[PDB]
Amino acid sequence: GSHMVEMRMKKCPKCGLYTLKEICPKCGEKTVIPKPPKFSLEDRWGKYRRMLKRALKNKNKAE
Ligand SMILES: [Zn+2]
Numbered sequence: 179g180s181h182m183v184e185m186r187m188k189k190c191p192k193c194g195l196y197t198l199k200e201i202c203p204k205c206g207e208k209t210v211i212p213k214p215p216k217f218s219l220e221d222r223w224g225k226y227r228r229m230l231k232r233a234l235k236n237k238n239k240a241e
Contacts, residue, residue, distance in 0.1 A: 185211055198238075 189195065189212035190202035200209055218224055 188212065 187196050187198045188200060188209035190197075190204065190207055191210045191212075192207045193202060193204050194212075195202055195204050195209070196212075197203065197209055201207070202209055223230070
């Protein structure tokens, strides 16, 4: 498609639980992508990831 779709489910870097709530229902810590990008053609948003974390509440949509 033209517009990029949000990455697949994530995993808690503290415990290791997978979910799509962006949060770990076990401990209560935000979840992160367990399978990060290894091959970057440009890596424009590479280091930017360090300052990519932001506060924004969104609503999920049913497929
Ligand atoms: Zn956790």
